[PDB]
C-alpha cells in the first residue's frame, strides 16, 4: 500500500532571503489501478491552498511516486510553525497524515573559532585548517570555506554532535596545499545559522 | 545592515 | 519468522591485549511456539564449536531475543577473517546466514594533532581542547583524554568522516575550566588504532 514521507526545507534556503524554502510531501507505492492522490496541507492547523503537484513519476517496480510541494515563508519556518501533509487514496482505508517543523527549543548562537594547522603537520604535502563551531541550537546549519572571494571546495564537515549542555558542535576541515598556507593566503570559514546576526558570520585564518 | 555570501544576499536587519 | 543481526567487536576490545573481543549474533522475533534456535558458526567457511549462548530474554511484545556470542582472537579479527552465523528456526523457510569481518583495505596510520583553544575563546568560562585525528583506515578507533595520569571525562568525539583520500578523520573535543588551561596544566589525547605502533599513541597539549 501507499506510504508517505514529508521532508523539510534545506537549512540554506530558510536562512537566505534570496532563496526559496519548500516542504515536500512524497507518496510512494501508488498503484497503477488507483493513481489518484489528494493532498491537504495545513500550517499550524489552518488549511493552505498554494501547494503544487510535481510531475507524476513511474517507478521501476510498477508503482508511481506522487509529490506535493508547498512553498514556505522563511520566518514562518524559523518561528517554528508546523506543516502538515494529509494524503488520501483509494488503496488507503484511512488518510495518512504527517507533520514536520523546526526542532523545538530556544535557538542558541553558534560560536565560531578557526584553528591553524598543528606545527607537527608542517612536514606534510598539505595542511588542515579547522573551523570549530560550538554552542549552536537547533542543529540546522551550513558551513563553507572561501579564499579571495572564491569558494574553496576541498573541505569535509562533521555531522552536528549533541553536547552535554544541550547545544550542538561540529568541526569543518579544509585541506590546502602547504605552499598555499605559506604564501599567506587568507582563508575564511563561513557559517549560516538562524541565531547568528543576519544568519551569517565569517571567521578568517592565515599564517601568523 | 546586511550579510552577503559570495555576492548573494543572506539577510538584513 | 525471526530476523538476525550480527555485530562486530568493540574497537577497544580488538585493540587491547587485555580485553576479550567477541562477535555477537542476535536473533529477534523468535516466537513463543518455537523458541528453539540452532546456531552454526563458521570462520572463513570452517565450522567452529566454541560459541556460547546468552540467557534467553523475554521482550514482552510476544517474542524472545536469543543471542549467541563467539569469542575471537585479536589477530584473527584484525587479519580480516570472516565470521559467519547460521540461524535455523522452525519459523524459517530456510536458515538465515549473516557475515561480518573487519572492513577491507590497507590499514593506514592516524595522524594525531592536538590543537589549543582559539584566542577568541579565551574570555569564556571554559575552553575547548581539540584532538584532530586524520588519515586512518579502517575507521575502527578509540579516543580518550587525561591529565596528570587521571582520566578527563568531559569530552565528546565526532563520528569518523570519510575523507577525500579514502581515509577517515574525526575530532575529539575536551572542555576544561579556563583557569585549568591558563595555569599551564598538560592535557593528553590518547588514540588506539591498529595501524599505530603498539596500537597506541598519546599526544599532549598545554599553554
Ligand atoms: C518501489 O520503488 C520505490 C523507489 O525506489 C527507488 O529506486 C529503486 C530502484 C532503489 O534504488 C530505491 O532505493 C529507490 O529509492 C521505493 O521507494 C522508496 O521507499 C522507501 C520506503 O519504502 C523510502 O525510504 C525512506 O527514505 C527516507 C529518506 O528518503 C530520501 O533519501 C533517499 C535516499 O537517501 C531518496 O531515495 C528519497 O527520494 C529521499 O530523498 C529526499 O527527497 C526530499 C524530497 O524531494 C528532498 O528534500 C527536498 O529537496 C528539494 C530539492 O531536491 C528541496 O531542497 C526541498 O526543500 C526539500 O524538501 C531531500 O533532499 C532528499 N534527500 C536525499 C538524501 O536525497 C527516510 O527518511 C525514511 O526513513 C523513515 O522511515 C523508515 C520506515 O519506513 C524508518 O526505518 C526510518 O527510521 C525513518 O522513520 C525511509 O527510509 C524511499 O525514499 C523511497 N524512494 C523514493 C525514491 O522515494 C518503494 O519503496 C518501492 N516499493 C515497493 C513496494 O517495492
Ligand atoms: C520486539 O521487541 C524487540 C526488542 O526491542 C526492545 O524492546 C521493545 C519493548 C522496544 O522498547 C524496543 O524499543 C527495544 O529495543 C525488537 O527487537 C528489535 O528489532 C529491530 C529489528 O526489527 C532491531 O533493529 C535493528 O537494530 C540494529 C542495531 O541494533 C543495535 O542497536 C540497537 C538500537 O541502538 C539496540 O537496541 C540493539 O541492542 C543493538 O545494540 C547493539 O547490540 C550489540 C550486540 O549485543 C552490541 O555489540 C556488542 O557489545 C558487547 C558489549 O555489550 C561486546 O562489546 C560485543 O563485542 C559486541 O558485539 C552493541 O554495542 C549494541 N549497539 C548499540 C548502538 O547499542 C540496526 O543496525 C538494524 O538496521 C539494519 O537492518 C535494516 C534492514 O534489515 C537496515 O534498515 C539498516 O540499515 C541496517 O542494515 C535494525 O534497525 C533492534 O536491534 C531490536 N532491538 C533489540 C534490543 O534487539 C523486536 O523487533 C520487536 N518485535 C516486534 C514484532 O514488535
Give all domains of chain C, ordered by start, each with its CATH number: 2-101 (2.60.40.10), 102-207 (2.60.40.10)
How far apart are alpha carbons C51 and C60 in whole angstroms?
27
- Touch between chain B and chain C: 3 or more Cβ pairs under 8 Å: no
DSSP helix/strand/coil, A138: coil
Query: Could you give the C-alpha distances from C5 to A184, C1, C86, in angstroms and in order?
Result: 52, 14, 11
Rounded Cα gap, residues A151 and C29, in angstroms: 51
Helical residues (DSSP H) of chain A, grouped into ranges:
11-15, 74-78, 178-182
Closest chain A residue by Cα to residue B13: A198
**Grid cell digits, residue A41:** 496541507
Chain Cα centroid distance, residue C203: 21
Cβ atoms A11, B10 nearer than 8 A: no
Residue C95 contacts residue C86 (beta carbons within 8 Å): yes
Elucidated via:
X-ray
Cα of C83 to ligand 2 centre, how many Å? Answer: 19
- Cα separation, C147 vs C204, in Å, equals 9
Which among C115, C120, C171 has the least Cβ separation from residue A158? C171
- Whether the CB of C118 sits within 6 Å of ligand 2: no
- Contact (CB, 8 A) for C27 and C37: yes
Residue C4 in grid coordinates: 538476525
Amino acid at each position: 500500500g501507499p506510504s508517505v514521507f514529508l521532508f523539510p526545507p534545506k537549512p540554506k534556503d530558510t536562512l537566505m532571503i534570496s532563496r526559496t524554502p519548500e516542504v515536500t510531501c512524497v507518496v510512494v507505492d501508488v498503484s497503477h489501478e488507483d493513481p489518484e492522490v489528494k493532498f491537504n496541507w495545513y500550517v499550524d492547523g489552518v488549511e493552505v491552498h498554494n501547494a503544487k503537484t510535481k510531475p507524476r513519476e513511474e517507478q521501476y517496480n510498477s508503482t508511481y511516486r506522487v509529490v506535493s510541494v508547498l512553498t514556505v515563508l522563511h520566518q514562518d519556518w524559523l518561528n517554528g510553525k508546523e506543516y502538515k501533509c494529509k494524503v488520501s487514496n483509494k488503496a488507503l482505508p484511512a488518510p495518512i497524515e504527517k507533520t514536520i517543523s523546526k526542532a523545538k527549543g530556544q535557538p542558541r548562537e553558534p560560536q565560531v573559532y578557526t584553528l591553524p594547522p598543528s606545527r607537527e603537520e608542517m612536514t606534510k604535502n598539505q595542511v588542515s585548517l579547522w573551523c570549530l563551531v560550538k554552542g549552536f541550537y537547533p542543529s540546522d546549519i551550513a558551513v563553507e570555506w572561501e579564499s579571495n572571494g572564491q569558494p574553496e571546495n576541498n573541505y569535509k564537515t562533521t555531522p552536528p554532535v549533541l553536547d552535554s549542555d544541550g547545544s550542538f558542535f561540529l568541526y569543518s576541515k579544509l585541506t590546502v596545499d602547504k605552499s598555499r598556507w605559506q604564501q599567506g593566503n587568507v582563508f575564511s570559514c563561513s557559517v549560516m545559522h538562524e541565531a547568528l546576526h543576519n544568519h551569517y558570520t565569517q571567521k578568517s585564518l592565515s599564517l601568523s | 545592515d546586511c550579510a552577503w555570501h559570495l555576492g548573494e544576499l543572506v539577510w538584513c536587519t
